[PDB]
Design an enzyme around this catalytic site. Structure first.
Site, PDB file in Angstrom:
ATOM      1  N   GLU A  68       6.471  -4.034   3.495  1.00 30.47           N
ATOM      2  CA  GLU A  68       7.907  -4.322   3.444  1.00 30.47           C
ATOM      3  C   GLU A  68       8.238  -5.593   4.244  1.00 30.47           C
ATOM      4  OE1 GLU A  68       9.321  -0.791   1.225  1.00 30.47           O
ATOM      5  OE2 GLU A  68       9.955  -2.872   1.550  1.00 30.47           O
ATOM      6  N   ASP A  99      11.452  -8.104  -1.712  1.00 33.59           N
ATOM      7  CA  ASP A  99      11.367  -6.650  -1.537  1.00 33.59           C
ATOM      8  C   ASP A  99      10.917  -5.969  -2.834  1.00 33.59           C
ATOM      9  OD1 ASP A  99      11.591  -4.012  -0.844  1.00 33.59           O
ATOM     10  OD2 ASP A  99      13.789  -3.974  -0.815  1.00 33.59           O
ATOM     11  N   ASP A 114       8.942  -0.725  -7.630  1.00 37.38           N
ATOM     12  CA  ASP A 114      10.328  -0.683  -8.101  1.00 37.38           C
ATOM     13  C   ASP A 114      11.223  -1.636  -7.316  1.00 37.38           C
ATOM     14  OD1 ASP A 114       9.840   1.321  -5.994  1.00 37.38           O
ATOM     15  OD2 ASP A 114      11.932   1.939  -6.272  1.00 37.38           O
ATOM     16  N   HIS A 170       5.653  -0.718  -2.938  1.00 39.23           N
ATOM     17  CA  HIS A 170       6.337  -0.204  -4.114  1.00 39.23           C
ATOM     18  C   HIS A 170       6.585  -1.295  -5.122  1.00 39.23           C
ATOM     19  CE1 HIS A 170      10.340  -1.872  -2.958  1.00 39.23           C
ATOM     20  NE2 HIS A 170       9.903  -1.654  -1.731  1.00 39.23           N
ATOM     21  N   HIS A 202      17.999  -7.074  -1.618  1.00 39.30           N
ATOM     22  CA  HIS A 202      19.144  -6.363  -2.228  1.00 39.30           C
ATOM     23  C   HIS A 202      20.338  -7.282  -2.495  1.00 39.30           C
ATOM     24  CE1 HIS A 202      17.749  -2.086  -0.846  1.00 39.30           C
ATOM     25  NE2 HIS A 202      16.721  -2.889  -1.065  1.00 39.30           N
ATOM     26  N   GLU A 246      10.354   3.842  -4.514  1.00 39.65           N
ATOM     27  CA  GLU A 246      10.621   3.838  -3.084  1.00 39.65           C
ATOM     28  C   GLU A 246      12.112   3.680  -2.809  1.00 39.65           C
ATOM     29  OE1 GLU A 246      11.785   1.194  -1.207  1.00 39.65           O
ATOM     30  OE2 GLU A 246      11.541   1.993   0.821  1.00 39.65           O
ATOM     31  N   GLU A 247      12.818   3.058  -3.748  1.00 38.67           N
ATOM     32  CA  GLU A 247      14.185   2.589  -3.509  1.00 38.67           C
ATOM     33  C   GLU A 247      15.240   3.639  -3.833  1.00 38.67           C
ATOM     34  OE1 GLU A 247      13.945  -1.910  -2.683  1.00 38.67           O
ATOM     35  OE2 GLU A 247      14.862  -0.056  -1.911  1.00 38.67           O
TER      36      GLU A 247
HETATM   37  N1  LIG Z   1      17.242   7.361  -0.770  1.00 34.93           N
HETATM   38  C1  LIG Z   1      16.747   6.531   0.322  1.00 34.93           C
HETATM   39  C2  LIG Z   1      16.220   5.228  -0.274  1.00 34.93           C
HETATM   40  C3  LIG Z   1      15.734   4.316   0.846  1.00 34.93           C
HETATM   41  C4  LIG Z   1      15.189   2.991   0.347  1.00 34.93           C
HETATM   42  C5  LIG Z   1      14.830   2.187   1.593  1.00 34.93           C
HETATM   43  N2  LIG Z   1      14.000   1.091   1.277  1.00 34.93           N
HETATM   44  C6  LIG Z   1      16.044   1.568   2.225  1.00 34.93           C
HETATM   45  O1  LIG Z   1      17.118   1.385   1.560  1.00 34.93           O
HETATM   46  O2  LIG Z   1      15.896   1.240   3.402  1.00 34.93           O
HETATM   47  C7  LIG Z   1      17.832   6.252   1.361  1.00 34.93           C
HETATM   48  O3  LIG Z   1      19.044   6.259   1.000  1.00 34.93           O
HETATM   49  O4  LIG Z   1      17.484   5.997   2.555  1.00 34.93           O
HETATM   50 ZN   LIG Z   2      10.938  -2.292  -0.135  1.00 32.14          ZN
HETATM   51 ZN   LIG Z   3      14.735  -2.269  -0.847  1.00 30.33          ZN
END
Ligand SMILES: N[C@H](CCC[C@H](N)C(=O)O)C(=O)O
Ligand SMILES: [Zn+2]
Ligand SMILES: [Zn+2]
Ligand SMILES: N[C@H](CCC[C@H](N)C(=O)O)C(=O)O
Ligand SMILES: [Zn+2]
Ligand SMILES: [Zn+2]
Lengths: 380, 380
Positions: free
Chosen positions: A167, A104, A73, A71, A353, A138-139
């Protein structure tokens, strides 16, 4: 003389990091990628849907089909002031590439792309198909990303045999972990109702923060399970909590709690919903809750891809990765719907993150080498 | 034939309620008031300071000086959708005047004004001085309101003998309570530091909501004291709580808690600060806190004003008010600095700072009568 490839990976990575692609906006990342792949004979297919951009790029016409997935994003930066370097600067300081998305996952995205490019240049008449499946969401909600591509391919019975998701899987040293599955993810958006009023007349009101305090403490300490042979334990995190009008002499009417569980198969989405309902009842709270399931636990059926990547890591950097299923989730679970074997490998996840996200440029280089060797192992 | 006065009170009240005077903006309230007082021979003196408007209006030149005190500002409404009638509509439905500020305190402000007007018209050569001290910021920071007027008067040795504050003192029936003092008010703005990160990698982060949950529960249940002969007990309320980036997969770096204590003399501002520090230490929390003292507990020395208002209520509606010190605070404490006896009386407080705030129009009429009789009792 493959320090040459390492430089290609690094400059692409920097290219991408500089684009502020907060989900679902691609900010031109896939255009860059598609342009350089097209020049090498990849068939380009755009699959935009709503506000999400997706790319399906292929070189080759036959099975097996091995797809690199990733991804473009990235999650929000936060105040750019809290960052040593600007979050989209792509500065390299003492062998570390800094920026949101560095780890990431723009770094390894670049590594996968260069590995694919170099393999195809070296082997124009290779067996199988080398593909890239890239999404700009993806996020976040991820309703129109990888899953849209998967649906499109399945509807015309196009196949993916193996999928490597780039990832960041590595824990302490590059290559120490690959992922053969992921826990589920479910989010609760919880609103507890009180009664607004005057802080100095609390008996004429009902403060939802006070009423929910015990619940909050129980929710954050409740032990869902202890994991099992296939997954680490379920974990709950409160991501957001808000109540109040900004005034210091008004009791708020409502408390908002957003919490997420990354869960293993010891529980289910239904068990989680029922238990939370039961906790709220036990504490006599008036509420409404909106549940949002992002995905369920998933395990891949191991085969030649796990073998190929495990061997490639051994062959390139000398250690054997442990296959694990911890951390977050990935778009792998969607691609599994096609019958594909799905395995993930990438750089260190320790800064993802976080403020001052970064990645080792030496690791990005070795990633390129590993992804390349994986292709050789699979196809040759 | 004093249903005539009742109508004057009601229409003034509606006039004022229609002006959205969120602290510190007067939105023209005092201009209306000053205009009608000037026409009856009151000496008008404006005392604006920064963004706050203040009015000191007098009729008479000698002691005793009896001042009516009140405020034209009101607390925020909230979504106008949550209101049956628009919050600034000033609708009268089934004998109830609806609107933000109806009960706190534009209704009784209007009643005090009309009482003063009618008394002065009836008694042009009255003994003493009848004054009105009106501010546009009682509800917020209140740094430039009544306290600015008090400082100005003291600096030129101008005297206030008695001050009637028209805040809504009544609990269940009009006249059942007058106030001879108030608890203190102190607010803590508390920031607990965690470490931002990925929700699925909580071991690489530190969630401040989770870390502070026990503290929050202890803070809201801790018993500061049990009051004493002069005050009800100290009470703590959390007014605001915020953490989070809006994302569901990011652990927030910081948790904000704003809490307020209305406190009696069993504790002090210093005791409160020390105990909270001790709770935070006990829970090993990293924090910063900003304390804001709005005022300390205050008790007035009872005398002819308490006598006059107590008697006026008995004479007008037949019950004897209890003298109490509960509820919120008022600008009375500032006016006490002049040596003035300070007593508060007004309508029902049951809807103040709430949605659908309202006040009985029959009660507003009787308030006018009570404030008028109080003046007679004091001066004649
Ligand atoms: N709406 C999804 C986004 C997941 C993104 C994924 N990369 C992570 O945070 O592990 C969630 O809340 O699981
Ligand atoms: Zn990722
Ligand atoms: Zn992420
Ligand atoms: N900044 C002051 C405003 C007080 C307004 C007063 N009317 C009340 O809420 O009782 C405080 O927090 O005490
Ligand atoms: Zn008030
Ligand atoms: Zn108020």
């Amino acid at each position: 003389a493959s320090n040459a490839m390492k430089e290609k990976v690094v400059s692409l990575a920097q290219d991408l990091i500089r684009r502020p692609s907060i989900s679902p906006n691609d900010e031109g990342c896939q255009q860059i990628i598609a342009e350089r792949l097209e020049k090498l004979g990849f068939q380009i297919e755009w699959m935009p849907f709503n506000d999400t951009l997706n790319l399906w790029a292929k070189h080759g016409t036959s099975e097996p089909v091995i797809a690199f997935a990733g991804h473009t994003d990235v999650v929000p930066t936060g105040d750019e002031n809290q960052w040593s370097s600007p979050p989209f600067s792509a500065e390299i300081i003492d062998g570390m590439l800094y920026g949101r998305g560095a780890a990431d996952m723009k770094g390894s995205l670049a590594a996968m792309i260069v590995a694919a490019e170099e393999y195809v240049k070296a082997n124009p008449n290779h067996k199988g198909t080398i593909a890239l499946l890239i999404t700009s969401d993806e996020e976040a909600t991820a309703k129109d990303g990888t899953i849209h591509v998967v649906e499109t391919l399945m509807a015309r019975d196009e196949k993916i045999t193996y999928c490597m998701v780039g990832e960041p899987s590595s824990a302490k040293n590059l290559g120490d972990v690959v992922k053969n599955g992921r826990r589920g993810s479910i989010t609760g958006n919880l609103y507890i109702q009180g009664i607004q009023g005057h802080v100095a007349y609390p008996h004429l009101a009902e403060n939802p923060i006070h009423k929910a305090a015990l619940f909050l403490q129980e929710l954050t300490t409740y032990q869902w399970d202890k994991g099992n042979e296939f997954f680490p334990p379920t974990s709950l995190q409160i991501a957001n909590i808000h109540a109040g009008t900004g005034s210091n002499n008004v009791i708020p009417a409502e408390l908002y709690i957003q919490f997420n569980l990354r869960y293993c198969t010891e529980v289910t989405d239904e068990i989680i919903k029922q238990k939370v309902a039961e906790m709220l009842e036990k504490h006599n709270l008036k509420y409404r809750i909106e549940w949002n399931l992002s995905g369920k636990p998933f395990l891949t059926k191991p085969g030649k891809l796990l073998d190929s990547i495990t061997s490639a890591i051994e062959e390139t950097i000398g250690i054997t990765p442990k296959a694990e299923t911890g951390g977050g989730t990935s778009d792998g679970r969607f691609i599994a719907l096609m019958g594909a074997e799905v395995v993930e490998f990438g750089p260190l996840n320790s800064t993802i993150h976080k403020v001052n996200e970064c990645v080792s440029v030496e690791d990005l280089g070795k990633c390129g080498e590993i992804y390349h060797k994986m292709l050789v192992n699979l196809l040759d």
